[PDB]
Structure 1
């Protein structure tokens, strides 16, 4: 069973803005996604402070960056809190409707697209480089789900049958002209430029 949902109008407009606005500095997508993974790791860590069982689904708190040139995908994996089905549907646990508004009003008063993260919607920056994003996620309180969207106003959710234990994988199916983000040295440069001080180990996988 694949369920198809309409994005809320503001989210669709946000995504359409991210996709069609000329904006060369695309590399910030990776900072935003790593920061999202970092927040999710903080969240499961905080919960585990008072209930260690919350880590039964996996004790290690990390972020993996996985490029795959043959699939043309870059995958960001964390072992953070993950998302329930309800979270996914509800704009992947973001306040995306009011976030989009504040971001818009910010763009008005001279904000840059690189500030998208300050408004709780940095996830959608994935669309600077990806023609399609697939999000596989497992929260302690729910089954494993796959969310997917090539934008154009709709997304799908289905149950996902390779278990990951707990966390979220963001699979970026890159646009054909953005394969530089599969390059080890390019990924290293960006992680060093924008994610130097993240508090969890970031492992860049080799091909």
Structure 2
């Protein structure tokens, strides 16, 4: 039983714009999601200052990137604060689009507070799987269209705490499934992240 919701008008506009743009430096999406992951980790860590038990659901603070080639999927996981069903369901958007019209580089998206949407530069569908200490695990899904769904999660691996951004990459952006490519993008735009960034690589035994 999934629930469907309509996106705020400006958001639907932003997604269409991003998923269709021919912008050339699409790799910036990884910088933005890692940044958001880092932000969520900061949150749970700061919250744990006066409520240590909050960390018990998942003691390790990390950002993990897992390419799943067979499915043409790239996952960006963090053991941050997570999001409840209400948070997933419920700006900076309009001002950013106006900046874009004037010539601003798409890479400024994060400074406008909407960097999450840069994922549509390399993917045409996304599932945000999240588990907040305050709610059950839920799945938020969008295909850049005007509506998104939120479903109680009974199909994905249990997240102790945190969020998984599961990107369904576009057929021409499959390079982001490659370990070599992924590393260089990370090393290039995320040198000062306080959390370990783990890359999960699958290698056939010799």
TM-score higher than 0.5 here? Answer: yes
Residue 177 of structure 2 corresponds to which residue in structure 1?
182
TM-score (norm 1): 0.94
CA RMSD of aligned residues (A): 0.9
Tell me the equivalent position of 2:116: 123
Q: CA deviation at 1:131?
A: 1.4
Q: Which residue of 2 aligns with 1:153?
A: 146
Deviation by residue 1:108-127 (Cα, 9 ceiling, x = unmatched): 44311111001111111111
Shift of 1:106: 2.3
Gaps of at least 5 residues in structure 1 are 91-97
1:18 — aligned with what?
Answer: 18
Structure 2: runs of 5+ lacking an equivalent:
none
Deviation at 1:59, TM superposition (A): 1.1
Distance in 2 (CA, whole Å) between partners of 1:206 and 1:70 is 13
Distance in 1 of aligned mates of 2:58 and 2:12: 35
Give the alignment's TM-score, normalised by structure 2.
0.94
Deviations 1:113-152 (A, max 9, x none): 1110011111111110111101100111111000111112
Alignment size in residue pairs: 200
- Equivalent positions of 1:10-159 (< 5 A) are 10-90=10-90, 98-159=91-152
Q: Hey, what does 1:194 align to over in structure 2?
A: 189
